[PDB]
Amino acid sequence: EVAHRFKDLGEENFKALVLIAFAQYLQQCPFEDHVKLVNEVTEFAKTCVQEPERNECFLQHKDDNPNLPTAFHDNEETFLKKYLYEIARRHPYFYAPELLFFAKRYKAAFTELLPKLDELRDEGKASSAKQRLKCASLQKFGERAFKAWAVARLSQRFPKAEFAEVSKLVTDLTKVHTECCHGDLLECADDRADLAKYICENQDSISSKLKECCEKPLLEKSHCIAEVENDEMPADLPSLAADFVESKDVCKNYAEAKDVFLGMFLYEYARRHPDYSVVLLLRLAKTYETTLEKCCAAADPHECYAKVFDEFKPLVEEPQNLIKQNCELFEQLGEYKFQNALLVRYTKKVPQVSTPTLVEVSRNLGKVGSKCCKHPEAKRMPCAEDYLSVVLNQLCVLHEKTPVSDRVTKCCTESLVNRRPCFSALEVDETYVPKEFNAETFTFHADICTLSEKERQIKKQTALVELVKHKPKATKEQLKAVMDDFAAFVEKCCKADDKETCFAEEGKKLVAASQAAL
């Protein structure tokens, strides 16, 4: 069996595959013993040219967080080999074909700055945290939940495919994700290749945009298959109501197969609305199912489940109007002023969260607007959930480690389908106690004129948050007045010859203006 495996994609990658194989499983062992073990298996593989609980014991051995944590020109082989082995031993479940793909970008960039070094690594660990999340979502919620999500996702991706092929792709894709969540590369990766092969044989019935992916080799084939741009709907489809609520025998076909009929509903709705978030599609499905369960047990379900679209309209109104109102606010304000507004809102509703946590949350939330609000509305809501999922899951994960408030604890533990809505509509925390005023937070030093502009922003924003935690009286008149006088004070005193004097002399002047007012 090593013959057909070795003749595919060459001789070089099998060496690194054996490397990261046990480098992820056993992590504390050094580097050179792995290299010799790699050659041990590699030369015997060229020479030729387990049981469930056994791998569960190997899974128990997997430590998700280990206790372990020019050279390119000299020897990029060992340089990337150590780099790959080190990433493998840091994250024991990281995507192995992506690990090799990141290594290609790694050696290509070295052979050729802050974005180059920072964005590359943080993207890999963010992707690493993404399969951990999808595996934690596989558990607790169940295979049916994943099935429903996958149905809405890949039916948005290929509307021209019939429901039978979409549901087929969903079953094998769940198998792929369950195997990759079990770290079973003996069952995942090849299933990924089997599914990538299967999609390429019947590419005509799925989508024509896949023609670029089947010419690629087995690695980047399935890679870009996860990156395919969505194909256009027939643009002539009827209203799904004519086959789901307007028609009769709805409670009939529901009794024939409850989930299959519900999957037909989601397949038709998602393929018609790619501009919706997959979370919104699952919001509409759970509302239709709950309506079907209540109405099908009545003497006349037709009059009951009729006007179910009146229940669909507000579920799509709330996120859509939030998209356009925050986009237009960010458009006129800019990223920084948008982040400041986000600072005020989220510190109003929940001031119990630590001041730093509120800062980077508002910072990256402004980055959410900076990225998605450039795209048209057809892709705004999908773009929004792609980043809001990671951001909201990030602050949720850290909140379980350090429980700060109860409203966020409730919102983090509820269904992922209603997380973004429940975090929204959260009123300003009532009976929040004004924090004790300490003037040491209102100290301004000439270093801010020397600080970098990106650093300057954080120093202003942290003072804005700690300001909100004091005197919750937040009428925008006092806020705008403080922002006007303080922003003018910072620059006017930065252009002074002796900024050390200007900062301290007008500080208490503006403090006595900030106070003795509210």
Binding site: K252, C296, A297, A299
Partner: protein, 466 residues
Amino acid sequence: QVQLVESGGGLVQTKTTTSVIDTTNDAQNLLTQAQTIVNTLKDYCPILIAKNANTPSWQTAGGGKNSCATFGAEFSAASDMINNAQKIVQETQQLSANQPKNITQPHNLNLNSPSSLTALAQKMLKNAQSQAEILKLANQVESDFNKLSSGHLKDYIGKCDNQKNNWGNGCAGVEETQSLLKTSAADFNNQTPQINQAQNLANTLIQELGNNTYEQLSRLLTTSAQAINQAVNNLNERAKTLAGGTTNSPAYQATLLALRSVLGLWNSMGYAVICGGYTKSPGENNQKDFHYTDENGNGTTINCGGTNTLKADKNVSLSIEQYEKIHEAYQILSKALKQAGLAPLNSKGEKLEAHVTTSKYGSLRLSCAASGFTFRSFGMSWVRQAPGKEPEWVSSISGSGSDTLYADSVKGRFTISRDNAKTTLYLQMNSLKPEDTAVYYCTIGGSLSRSSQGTQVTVSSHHHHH
């Protein structure tokens, strides 16, 4: 795979017999016909149907309990009207039996002997006493009608308001007959000074007969000579309209009120009366439909017999025989009140032919053994095909079985009923016409079919027995 296996019946042959009864429209017959209704209702006291502004107030009130629990004083007032009206028929017999005579020879002792004047004075006061009793009895049933109304059957009796049945209403004209009884007894109560004078005059004569013959004849020849003749004259003129009169007789309007009121209470309440109780063989079908065809053609029907068969005891339903006599007495009373009318209390009565139509073998329940799906949380329904015609939904039930919907053509005859345990849906058809010939299938929601359905035959035969 969902399995719907309809296992009902096939060929139905519904026989219906019209038997014509030859009776008479005289008072004492109709009074016995009315006693049949009322006495059966009191003495056996059936449970009412426990069914809602549309339905009568007494229905939601005394539904599911015995009849006398709700219509105790209404049965008692009705029986009083009947027995009192019977007394006034007997008393008009004695009235016409004792008719006084005029004084022929004013000056004579050959005829007009002491014995003849004694017998004549007896005929005077016996005539006046009988007249007084039936006037008392006439106002007695008038009070018993005010008691029968203004109770549970007020805004029911006396108001009248296929199509919608006219049950629950009196529709018997009791307001009109009563108003005639008021005016009738008003004029006769105004004649009370005359009848009291004739009473006393006869009582003076029976004492004057104790006086000496020649001595009393001396003053009798010369005055209480024409006085008797006068008094006897208005006494006979009164007894003629009192017995032979219709709108003028308080005794005619009283008997007519007692009969129309017994028709009224059965029209207002009889539909709720539970019948079909078994006497032997617990569960005997005995399902006989009793047809009620009113005078203008619009006919209803009551399904009596039949989990629906219990005993035929007092306060526990009625027998089919008991309802048979109630139906015969109603149809004999409906006619001769609608067509012949009441014959004068002194008249002999005229013949009339009253039909009683009743059918049998017009019932059949169907069953659909549902499976392969969660039968308990799915509202089921029945549909029937019939040749050529598009599928016609007949009835539908909710998941719990509390909500039931029926089509207009089926409304009133069939009854849907599911069994969440054992998961079987039933359709109980009653009083089914040949136009029900259709293959019947049960279905989840409705519309189309996905089963081996039921069977499609119905045949009706009619017999006119005499």
